């Protein structure tokens, strides 16, 4: 029974918490044990949902937060509909306006290295990459940040609020040294 686990259950939305729990168990990890990852997954999830809300009505197809089988099903349909190359790894969104998959990153480490690693892991470069940080930086492929300023600024504001609430509970240091 950890502090971090009760903090995330009171800081995040119950639908987020439940999607994160299902995600971890699906991949064989327990939110009561990997409590920092529990917090990271909830955070990444809230950011993906905030991101897809930044566009227009039908702009984004949401891939993250689904179970692996149906997440790939929607990808297959998108690819067999748009002609876009099927990614090797599951992305987080699809942009019907720009016709590309988006990989959304939330890092506690430093802006530049995270993109590299995630770029070298993707290693296909078809899908667009967008990174956010807990300190307020962002970085996107070809410096095309997809959404307008205010929607990304809202995402950055919420990330710093998560940081503050954790720091005020002396949980930030453990979370930062977890990646
Ligand atoms: O969809 C993804 N993974 C498929 C599911 O993998 C799982 C693995 C274990 C438990 C549950 C699910 C995906 N994964 C990653 C990172 C890097 C690759 C491994 N990884 C993770 O283990 C995910 O933990 C994170 C670390 C930092 C920030 C956010 C996250 Cl969520 N980052 C993303 O932005 C992302 O969308
Ligand atoms: Mn994902
Ligand atoms: Mn992601």
Separation CA 115–CA 28 (nearest Å)? 26
Q: Widest CA span of the chain, in angstroms?
A: 49
| Whole-angstrom distance, CA of residue 28 vs CA of residue 64 | 17
Kindly list the structural domains of the chain, giving each domain's residue range(s) and its CATH number in brackets, ordered by start.
Answer: 1-179 (3.40.91.90)
Structure tokens at 122: 């993707």
Q: State the Cα–Cα distance between residues 61 and 26, nearest whole angstrom.
A: 22
Experimental method: X-ray
Q: Half-sphere exposure (CA, 13 Å, Cβ side) for 103?
A: 23
Question: Ligand 3 centre from 176 Cα, in Å?
Answer: 18
In angstroms, the CA 141 to CA 91 distance is 14
- Name residues whose C-beta falls within 8 Å of residue 85's C-beta, 6 or more positions apart in sequence: 79, 124, 126
62 φ, ψ (degrees, to nearest 5): -90, 120
How open is the CA angle 155-156-158, to the nearest 5 degrees? 65
| Contact yes or no for 129/122 (Cβ under 8 A) | yes
Mutate to test the pocket of ligand 1, among 25, 30, 41, 139 (most ligand atoms within 8 A of CB): 41
CA end-to-end distance (rounded Å), the chain: 22
Q: How far apart are CA 174 and CA 69, in angstroms?
A: 33
Beta bridge partners of 103: 129
Q: Annotated binding site, which residues?
A: 44, 64, 92, 103-104
Q: Output the residue whose Cα is nearest ligand 1's atom 36.
A: 92
Count other Cβ atoms within 10 Å, centred on residue 159.
20
| HEC per residue, the chain | CCHHHHHHHHHCCHHHHHHHHHHHHHCCCCCCCCHHHHHHHHHHHHHHHHHHCCCCCCCEEECCCCCHHHHHHHHHHHHHHHCCCCCCCCCCEEECCCCEEEEEEEECCCHHHHHHHHHHHHCCCCCEEEEEECCCCEEEHHHCCCCCHHHHHHHHHHHHHHHHHHHHCCCHHHHHCCC
The closest ligand to the CA of 19 turns out to be: 1
d(CA 82, CA 101): 11
For residue 142, give both structure tokens. Answer: 């070809």
Q: Is 27 in the pocket of ligand 1 (CB under 6 A)?
A: yes
User: Which long-range contacts (C-beta less than 8 Å, at least 24 apart) are formed by 24-32?
Assistant: 26/67, 26/68, 31/5, 32/1, 32/2, 32/5
CA-nearest of 85, 2, 84, 66 to 39 is 2
Residues 90 and 37: their CA atoms lie apart, in Å, by 18
* C-beta of 108 in contact with ligand 1 (< 6 A): no
């Amino acid at each position: 029974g950890s502090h971090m686990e009760d903090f995330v259950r009171q800081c995040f939305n119950p639908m987020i918490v439940e999607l994160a729990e299902k995600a971890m168990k699906e991949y064989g990890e327990d939110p009561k044990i990997e409590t920092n990852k529990f917090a990271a997954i909830c955070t990444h999830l809230e950011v993906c949902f905030m991101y897809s809300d930044g566009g227009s009505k039908h702009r984004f197809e949401i891939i993250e937060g689904r179970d692996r089988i149906m997440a790939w099903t929607v990808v297959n349909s998108i690819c067999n509909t748009t002609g876009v190359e099927k990614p090797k790894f599951l992305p987080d969104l699809y942009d019907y306006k720009e016709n590309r998959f988006i990989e959304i990153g939330v890092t506690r480490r430093e802006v530049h290295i995270y993109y590299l690693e995630k770029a070298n892991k993707i290693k296909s470069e078809k899908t667009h990459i967008h990174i956010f940080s807990f300190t307020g930086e962002e970085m996107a492929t070809k410096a095309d940040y997809t959404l307008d300023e205010e929607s990304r600024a809202r995402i950055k504001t919420r990330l710093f609020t998560i940081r503050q609430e954790m720091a005020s509970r002396s949980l930030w240091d453990s979370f930062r040294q977890s990646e």
